[PDB]
Design a protein around this motif. Structure first.
Motif, PDB file in Angstrom:
ATOM      1  N   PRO A   1       0.954  -0.856  -0.047  1.00  0.00           N
ATOM      2  CA  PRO A   1       0.060   0.110  -0.007  1.00  0.00           C
ATOM      3  C   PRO A   1       1.263   1.043  -0.237  1.00  0.00           C
ATOM      4  O   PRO A   1       1.877   1.430   0.913  1.00  0.00           O
ATOM      5  CB  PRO A   1      -0.626  -0.533   1.469  1.00  0.00           C
ATOM      6  N   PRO A   2       0.630   1.983  -0.504  1.00  0.00           N
ATOM      7  CA  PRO A   2       1.514   3.721  -0.848  1.00  0.00           C
ATOM      8  C   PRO A   2       1.894   4.180   0.567  1.00  0.00           C
ATOM      9  O   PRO A   2       3.286   4.142   0.002  1.00  0.00           O
ATOM     10  CB  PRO A   2       0.589   4.480  -1.072  1.00  0.00           C
ATOM     11  N   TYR A   3       1.070   3.780   1.314  1.00  0.00           N
ATOM     12  CA  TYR A   3       1.111   4.718   2.532  1.00  0.00           C
ATOM     13  C   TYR A   3       2.475   3.588   3.481  1.00  0.00           C
ATOM     14  O   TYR A   3       3.297   4.163   4.602  1.00  0.00           O
ATOM     15  CB  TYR A   3       0.502   4.664   3.969  1.00  0.00           C
ATOM     16  N   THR A   4       2.586   3.249   2.746  1.00  0.00           N
ATOM     17  CA  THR A   4       3.681   2.108   3.762  1.00  0.00           C
ATOM     18  C   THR A   4       5.560   1.852   2.916  1.00  0.00           C
ATOM     19  O   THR A   4       6.400   2.146   3.749  1.00  0.00           O
ATOM     20  CB  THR A   4       3.411   0.741   3.443  1.00  0.00           C
ATOM     21  N   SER A   5       5.447   2.653   1.587  1.00  0.00           N
ATOM     22  CA  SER A   5       6.790   2.798   1.499  1.00  0.00           C
ATOM     23  C   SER A   5       7.958   4.001   2.529  1.00  0.00           C
ATOM     24  O   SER A   5       6.801   4.793   2.883  1.00  0.00           O
ATOM     25  CB  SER A   5       6.269   3.497   0.061  1.00  0.00           C
ATOM     26  N   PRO A   6       8.593   3.655   2.559  1.00  0.00           N
ATOM     27  CA  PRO A   6       9.197   2.339   1.807  1.00  0.00           C
ATOM     28  C   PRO A   6       9.981   0.924   2.637  1.00  0.00           C
ATOM     29  O   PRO A   6      10.825   0.306   2.394  1.00  0.00           O
ATOM     30  CB  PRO A   6      11.045   3.662   1.571  1.00  0.00           C
ATOM     31  N   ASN A   7       9.364   0.932   3.515  1.00  0.00           N
ATOM     32  CA  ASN A   7       9.134  -0.261   4.706  1.00  0.00           C
ATOM     33  C   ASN A   7       8.967  -1.626   3.336  1.00  0.00           C
ATOM     34  O   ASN A   7       7.925  -1.302   2.698  1.00  0.00           O
ATOM     35  CB  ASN A   7       8.196   0.016   5.609  1.00  0.00           C
ATOM     36  N   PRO A   8      10.195  -2.166   4.056  1.00  0.00           N
ATOM     37  CA  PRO A   8      10.270  -3.847   2.471  1.00  0.00           C
ATOM     38  C   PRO A   8       8.955  -4.478   3.602  1.00  0.00           C
ATOM     39  O   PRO A   8       8.799  -5.169   3.038  1.00  0.00           O
ATOM     40  CB  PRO A   8      11.616  -4.190   2.368  1.00  0.00           C
ATOM     41  N   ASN A   9       8.446  -4.211   4.746  1.00  0.00           N
ATOM     42  CA  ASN A   9       7.454  -5.051   5.640  1.00  0.00           C
ATOM     43  C   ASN A   9       7.022  -4.253   5.822  1.00  0.00           C
ATOM     44  O   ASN A   9       6.555  -3.739   6.388  1.00  0.00           O
ATOM     45  CB  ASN A   9       8.339  -5.591   7.263  1.00  0.00           C
ATOM     46  N   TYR A  10       6.025  -4.568   4.641  1.00  0.00           N
ATOM     47  CA  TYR A  10       4.078  -3.941   3.685  1.00  0.00           C
ATOM     48  C   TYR A  10       3.413  -4.391   4.751  1.00  0.00           C
ATOM     49  O   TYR A  10       2.471  -3.946   4.827  1.00  0.00           O
ATOM     50  CB  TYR A  10       4.325  -3.153   2.872  1.00  0.00           C
ATOM     51  N   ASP A  11       3.122  -5.931   4.883  1.00  0.00           N
ATOM     52  CA  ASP A  11       2.059  -6.883   5.784  1.00  0.00           C
ATOM     53  C   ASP A  11       3.015  -7.515   7.034  1.00  0.00           C
ATOM     54  O   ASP A  11       4.124  -7.985   7.016  1.00  0.00           O
ATOM     55  CB  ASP A  11       1.656  -6.985   3.939  1.00  0.00           C
ATOM     56  N   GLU A  12       1.315  -8.515   7.245  1.00  0.00           N
ATOM     57  CA  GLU A  12       1.944  -8.531   8.540  1.00  0.00           C
ATOM     58  C   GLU A  12       2.966  -9.929   8.539  1.00  0.00           C
ATOM     59  O   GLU A  12       3.634 -10.476   8.304  1.00  0.00           O
ATOM     60  CB  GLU A  12       0.811  -9.362   9.460  1.00  0.00           C
ATOM     61  N   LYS A  13       2.857 -10.540   7.105  1.00  0.00           N
ATOM     62  CA  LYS A  13       3.404 -11.876   6.986  1.00  0.00           C
ATOM     63  C   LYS A  13       5.262 -11.080   6.496  1.00  0.00           C
ATOM     64  O   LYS A  13       5.392 -12.456   6.902  1.00  0.00           O
ATOM     65  CB  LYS A  13       2.977 -12.279   5.707  1.00  0.00           C
ATOM     66  N   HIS A  14       5.362  -9.768   6.531  1.00  0.00           N
ATOM     67  CA  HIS A  14       6.907  -9.795   5.869  1.00  0.00           C
ATOM     68  C   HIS A  14       7.696  -9.660   6.741  1.00  0.00           C
ATOM     69  O   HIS A  14       8.565 -10.135   7.351  1.00  0.00           O
ATOM     70  CB  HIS A  14       6.690  -8.697   5.435  1.00  0.00           C
ATOM     71  N   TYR A  15       6.366  -8.745   7.882  1.00  0.00           N
ATOM     72  CA  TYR A  15       6.938  -8.425   9.322  1.00  0.00           C
ATOM     73  C   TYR A  15       7.289  -9.613  10.226  1.00  0.00           C
ATOM     74  O   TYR A  15       8.698  -9.932  11.096  1.00  0.00           O
ATOM     75  CB  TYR A  15       5.884  -7.638   9.910  1.00  0.00           C
ATOM     76  N   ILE A  16       6.760 -10.721  10.283  1.00  0.00           N
ATOM     77  CA  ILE A  16       6.866 -11.531  11.106  1.00  0.00           C
ATOM     78  C   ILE A  16       7.858 -12.627  10.354  1.00  0.00           C
ATOM     79  O   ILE A  16       8.798 -13.336  11.414  1.00  0.00           O
ATOM     80  CB  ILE A  16       5.185 -12.677  11.471  1.00  0.00           C
ATOM     81  N   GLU A  17       8.163 -12.528   9.077  1.00  0.00           N
ATOM     82  CA  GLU A  17       8.992 -13.514   8.305  1.00  0.00           C
ATOM     83  C   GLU A  17      10.898 -12.814   8.263  1.00  0.00           C
ATOM     84  O   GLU A  17      11.759 -13.647   8.995  1.00  0.00           O
ATOM     85  CB  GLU A  17       8.780 -13.532   7.003  1.00  0.00           C
ATOM     86  N   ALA A  18      10.137 -11.815   9.315  1.00  0.00           N
ATOM     87  CA  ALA A  18      11.637 -11.302   9.259  1.00  0.00           C
ATOM     88  C   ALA A  18      11.813 -11.016  11.182  1.00  0.00           C
ATOM     89  O   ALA A  18      12.854 -10.729  11.217  1.00  0.00           O
ATOM     90  CB  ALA A  18      11.371  -9.330   9.247  1.00  0.00           C
ATOM     91  N   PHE A  19      10.798 -11.306  11.635  1.00  0.00           N
ATOM     92  CA  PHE A  19      11.064 -10.482  13.275  1.00  0.00           C
ATOM     93  C   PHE A  19      11.498 -11.456  13.820  1.00  0.00           C
ATOM     94  O   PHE A  19      12.028 -12.239  14.544  1.00  0.00           O
ATOM     95  CB  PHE A  19      10.131 -10.664  13.051  1.00  0.00           C
ATOM     96  N   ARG A  20      11.111 -13.182  13.621  1.00  0.00           N
ATOM     97  CA  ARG A  20      10.932 -14.461  14.014  1.00  0.00           C
ATOM     98  C   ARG A  20      11.849 -14.828  13.792  1.00  0.00           C
ATOM     99  O   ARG A  20      12.876 -15.426  15.408  1.00  0.00           O
ATOM    100  CB  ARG A  20      10.214 -15.527  13.360  1.00  0.00           C
ATOM    101  N   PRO A  21      13.205 -15.030  13.047  1.00  0.00           N
ATOM    102  CA  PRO A  21      14.722 -14.796  13.212  1.00  0.00           C
ATOM    103  C   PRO A  21      15.501 -14.468  13.969  1.00  0.00           C
ATOM    104  O   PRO A  21      16.159 -14.642  15.335  1.00  0.00           O
ATOM    105  CB  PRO A  21      14.933 -14.932  12.017  1.00  0.00           C
ATOM    106  N   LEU A  22      15.155 -13.469  14.221  1.00  0.00           N
ATOM    107  CA  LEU A  22      15.724 -12.193  15.290  1.00  0.00           C
ATOM    108  C   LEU A  22      15.708 -12.407  16.555  1.00  0.00           C
ATOM    109  O   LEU A  22      16.506 -12.329  17.135  1.00  0.00           O
ATOM    110  CB  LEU A  22      15.402 -10.769  15.300  1.00  0.00           C
ATOM    111  N   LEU A  23      14.324 -12.981  16.460  1.00  0.00           N
ATOM    112  CA  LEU A  23      13.752 -12.990  18.018  1.00  0.00           C
ATOM    113  C   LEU A  23      14.691 -14.860  17.993  1.00  0.00           C
ATOM    114  O   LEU A  23      14.956 -14.765  19.796  1.00  0.00           O
ATOM    115  CB  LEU A  23      12.567 -13.197  18.593  1.00  0.00           C
ATOM    116  N   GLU A  24      14.557 -15.471  17.740  1.00  0.00           N
ATOM    117  CA  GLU A  24      14.815 -16.810  17.505  1.00  0.00           C
ATOM    118  C   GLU A  24      16.257 -17.024  17.987  1.00  0.00           C
ATOM    119  O   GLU A  24      16.797 -17.068  18.868  1.00  0.00           O
ATOM    120  CB  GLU A  24      14.342 -16.964  16.484  1.00  0.00           C
ATOM    121  N   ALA A  25      17.553 -16.113  16.841  1.00  0.00           N
ATOM    122  CA  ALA A  25      18.588 -16.333  17.763  1.00  0.00           C
ATOM    123  C   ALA A  25      19.103 -15.419  18.422  1.00  0.00           C
ATOM    124  O   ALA A  25      20.284 -15.518  18.721  1.00  0.00           O
ATOM    125  CB  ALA A  25      19.151 -15.058  15.807  1.00  0.00           C
TER     126      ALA A  25
END
Ligand SMILES: CO[C@@H]1O[C@H](CO)[C@@H](S[C@@H]2O[C@H](CO)[C@@H](O[C@@H]3O[C@H](CO)[C@@H](O[C@@H]4O[C@H](CO)[C@@H](N)[C@H](O)[C@H]4O)[C@H](O)[C@H]3O)[C@H](O)[C@H]2O)[C@H](O)[C@H]1O
Ligand SMILES: CO[C@@H]1O[C@H](CO)[C@@H](S[C@@H]2O[C@H](CO)[C@@H](O[C@@H]3O[C@H](CO)[C@@H](O)[C@H](O)[C@H]3O)[C@H](O)[C@H]2O)[C@H](O)[C@H]1O
Ligand SMILES: *[C@@H]1O[C@H](CO)[C@@H](O)[C@H](O)[C@H]1NC(C)=O
Length: 361
Positions: free
Chosen positions: A231-255
């Protein structure tokens, strides 16, 4: 190791039902909207313990109803969904949902007692599977809002009281999810690593309680689980929906020692893009709809469930500029008005959500 949303039905509480039937429906003459309102009343959203008075009244009543249904043979058994939401100096970066307790007026003691009482009630109802969201916005504010005097002033208290809650509510029939903001808050590249550091440290300092299942995202916000283009209002965040956020966040938490599973609020996510002019516009946003219905069938290994945490129709904040709890976010061009106090029924908003519901009612 169990997904707490598997093997149970979610109880739809009578408080949201009562709002829709006593407040909304009598004001909605339109036949299709009236029928839709009756159907959404049955979608099982979380019940909030937003004031201390609710602990010995509404919490007990819901758990007692679930117990009775399960004893009568409900198959699958019903489970409860509860939000813990009464930190002193609550909502530290905004005005709209300021709470009843203040750190400067015995708030810390008041909160510990509240948590102790919730524990006692959950012990008494250990036969009822209970899923908890812990303190929406609190830790997310500790990540990004240390520059706000109320938040910096509350930080040590938030930390102490979060650990207190995680240990005290670590009970055999409970699953807890700490609130973790959303893609447009903590998912920004500049915020996501310090977020992971904070949540994992809280988890470790709490002794990694067994009942801590993970994190909740998108609570009281509008983000998509998954869309094909930002969505336009999300630029330039590459994590523009919850799936992207979660897929990026989980590895960092698990580490960092916290292999968090997630639940994602979709209660006001049905229409994408929303009518938000900027992504940080959280209050009563126009152009939103009821979203995907609660389910454990997420199709994603890191996501236990799509849920409705914020009950759509309950206001995010007053648009009355003279009110004590007036927050400028609620007076913006993309906030629906006039809006009553946070938590109060906002019927025109409820109607918007019905109109824009996807899937529709
Ligand atoms: C490159 O573009 C720019 O990048 C920077 C980051 O490098 C961001 S700064 C980033 O902006 C976000 C807005 O997209 C901020 O998120 C917002 O934070 C507020 C708190 O300050 C959240 O408000 C809270 O919302 C809750 C509902 O979700 C509500 N219950 C609370 O009462 C309310 O306080 C809001 O949701 C969130 O979206 C972020 O903090 C900040 O770091 C810049 O925006 C880009 O242009
Ligand atoms: C983030 O903002 C918060 O959002 C949550 C979820 O919408 C609400 S919790 C909400 O709060 C209201 C006001 O306390 C409750 O409505 C009231 O229920 C009492 C009985 O408990 C009635 O006496 C009263 O008439 C009624 O308005 C809802 O039931 C809760 O779900 C929170 O307030 C926001 O700050
Ligand atoms: C919170 O409610 C409990 C009953 O659940 C009550 O005994 C206590 O006094 C209340 N706390 C405050 C600070 O009034």
């Amino acid at each position: 190791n169990g997904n707490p949303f598997e093997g149970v039905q979610l109880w739809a509480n009578n408080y949201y039902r009562s709002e829709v039937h006593t407040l909304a429906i009598p004001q909605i003459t339109d036949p299709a909207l009236r029928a839709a309102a009756s159907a959404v009343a049955e979608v099982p959203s979380f019940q909030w313990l937003d004031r201390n008075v609710t602990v010995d009244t509404l919490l007990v009543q819901t758990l007692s109803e679930i117990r009775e249904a399960n004893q009568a043979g409900a198959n699958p058994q019903y489970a409860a969904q509860i939000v813990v939401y009464d930190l002193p100096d609550r909502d530290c970066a905004a005005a709209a949902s300021n709470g009843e307790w203040a750190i400067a007026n015995n708030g810390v003691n008041n909160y510990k007692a509240y948590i102790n009482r919730i524990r006692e009630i959950l012990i008494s109802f250990s036969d009822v599977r209970t899923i908890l969201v812990i303190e929406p916005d609190s830790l997310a504010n500790m990540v990004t809002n240390m520059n706000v005097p109320k938040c910096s002033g509350a930080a040590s208290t938030y930390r102490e009281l979060t650990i207190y809650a995680l240990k005290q509510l670590d009970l055999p029939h409970v699953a807890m999810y700490m609130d973790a903001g959303h893609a447009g808050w903590l998912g920004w590249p500049a915020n996501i690593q310090p977020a992971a550091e904070l949540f994992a440290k809280i988890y470790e300092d709490a002794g990694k309680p067994r009942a801590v299942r993970g994190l909740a995202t998108n609570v009281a916000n509008y983000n998509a689980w998954s869309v094909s283009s930002p969505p336009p209002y999300t630029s330039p965040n590459p994590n523009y929906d919850e799936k992207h956020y979660i897929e990026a966040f989980r590895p960092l938490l698990e580490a960092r020692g916290f292999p968090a599973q997630f639940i994602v609020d979709q209660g006001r996510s049905g229409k994408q893009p929303t009518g938000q002019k900027e992504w940080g516009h959280w209050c009563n946003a126009i152009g939103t709809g009821f979203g995907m219905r609660p389910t454990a069938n997420t199709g994603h290994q890191y996501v236990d469930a799509f849920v409705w945490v914020k009950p759509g129709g309950e206001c995010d904040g007053t648009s009355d500029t003279t009110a004590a709890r007036y927050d400028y976010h609620c007076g913006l061009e993309d906030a629906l008005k006039p809006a009553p106090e946070a938590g109060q029924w906002f019927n025109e908003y409820f109607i918007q959500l019905l109109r824009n519901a996807n899937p529709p009612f």
